[PDB]
Amino acid sequence: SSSIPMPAGVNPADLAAELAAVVTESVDEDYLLYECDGQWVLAAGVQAMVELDSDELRVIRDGVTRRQQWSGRPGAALGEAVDRLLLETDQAFGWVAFEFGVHRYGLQQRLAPHTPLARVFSPRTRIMVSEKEIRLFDAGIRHREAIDRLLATGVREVPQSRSVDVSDDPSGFRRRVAVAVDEIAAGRYHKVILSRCVEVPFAIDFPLTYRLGRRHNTPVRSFLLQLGGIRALGYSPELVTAVRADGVVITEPLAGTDDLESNSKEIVEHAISVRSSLEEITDIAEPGSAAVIDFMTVRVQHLGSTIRARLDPSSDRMAALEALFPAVTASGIPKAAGVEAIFRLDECPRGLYSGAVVMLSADGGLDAALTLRAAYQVGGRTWLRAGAGIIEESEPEREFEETCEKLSTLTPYLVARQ
Numbered sequence: 001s002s003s004i005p006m007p008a009g010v011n012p013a014d015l016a017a018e019l020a021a022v023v024t025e026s027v028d029e030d031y032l033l034y035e036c037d038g039q040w041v042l043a044a045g046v047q048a049m050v051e052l053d054s055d056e057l058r059v060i061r062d063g064v065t066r067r068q069q070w071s072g073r074p075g076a077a078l079g080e081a082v083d084r085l086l087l088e089t090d091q092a093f094g095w096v097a098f099e100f101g102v103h104r105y106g107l108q109q110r111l112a113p114h115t116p117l118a119r120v121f122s123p124r125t126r127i128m129v130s131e132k133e134i135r136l137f138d139a140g141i142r143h144r145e146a147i148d149r150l151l152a153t154g155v156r157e158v159p160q161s162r163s164v165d166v167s168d169d170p171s172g173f174r175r176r177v178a179v180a181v182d183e184i185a186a187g188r189y190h191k192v193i194l195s196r197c198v199e200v201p202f203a204i205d206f207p208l209t210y211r212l213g214r215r216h217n218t219p220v221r222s223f224l225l226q227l228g229g230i231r232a233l234g235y236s237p238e239l240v241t242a243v244r245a246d247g248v249v250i251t252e253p254l255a256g257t258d259d260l261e262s263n264s265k266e267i268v269e270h271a272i273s274v275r276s277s278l279e280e281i282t283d284i285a286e287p288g289s290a291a292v293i294d295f296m297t298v299r300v301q302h303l304g305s306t307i308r309a310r311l312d313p314s315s316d317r318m319a320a321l322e323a324l325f326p327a328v329t330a331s332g333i334p335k336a337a338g339v340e341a342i343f344r345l346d347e348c349p350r351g352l353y354s355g356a357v358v359m360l361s362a363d364g365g366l367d368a369a370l371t372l373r374a375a376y377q378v379g380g381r382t383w384l385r386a387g388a389g390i391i392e393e394s395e396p397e398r399e400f401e402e403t404c405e406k407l408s409t410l411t412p413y414l415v416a417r418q
């Protein structure tokens, strides 16, 4: 059957993460698990893959890689290829780099060749885990048998975590901050977010770390993946974009930090962001469809606003994502200038950090979550990355401390490789 009853006492995050580890290894496949609105979707197995790089677009199907050059907007390029996958299957999953959002500002020339912009795939099988049920899509006996074996076994106990020191500043985050402050004071831009990488000196178990962290984090969206040599996990603090089948587009910028409601620094910054999103959404919206619906409402508690619109017929979901990308929250104000500065003052390319993780539907749906509070493994390297907004009054030591706080979303929950 399509449906299985959820076992009592079992958290959905825990079960989906267990499925992700056990079932995929069994059948030799890559995966992405995405948490959206009480559903944990495990997209298992790469049926077809879209790789969009700075200098090339690749579609790999059935063992055949078909390479194309592309020009113009990255979203249009990505959209066309993804649309093709979605004729064949219902949903597509992936990640989008920070670097995806640089073309709109004409910064693409800065990118080295073979710089990844996006990886989007359609799954061989889907498993959806929620509180009530497990739903199976395109699951063969092999997958089905595996889910069945796990379900019987139950979830593994999470081992004790292993600590890491975040006090070093090898990349000189503090000095880099100062430089930003000077540029701000000189009126180059209002804001930039700068970040630092922290290497983790041991290998971690990604699914087990994801479970431990999820227990102590309540995020807007979350993810765990093994894709194309990359392991990653994260607790996304913001939604970049949600586009519905009906054409309604949403973005929800959050303020961060009683005194949230009254504090001036936040309010000015949140308002400026709200203005930015509204302006961006407007370019892709039916005239007169754009509104801010829940302004500066308190929603951990956060300040946030909901910006909504109707996707114009001339435009599409990728265009909406490009209009809103990268998020102000991890870039700067004004955006073009903040992004420019990031090439200069931060370690580039960013890749997954400050990019998005995406779920797309054949119905026209898009869900894109901002990648922050995440861990990465590529090659032999395991790392964490956190950053801070920098404005004219910012202090390098305080900003360093801020990074440490953000790192603490993950630093206590690292489970070493098994």
Ligand SMILES: O=C(O)/C(=C/C1CC1)Oc1cccc(C(=O)O)c1O
Pocket: 193, 195, 237, 238, 253, 254, 255, 256, 257, 302, 329, 330, 372, 373, 385, 386, 387, 388, 389, 406
């Ligand atoms: O500014 C904040 O507190 C913030 C707000 C989010 C919207 C709710 O979170 C972040 C902003 C920028 C960078 C990071 C980071 O982890 O790298 C970050 O977590």
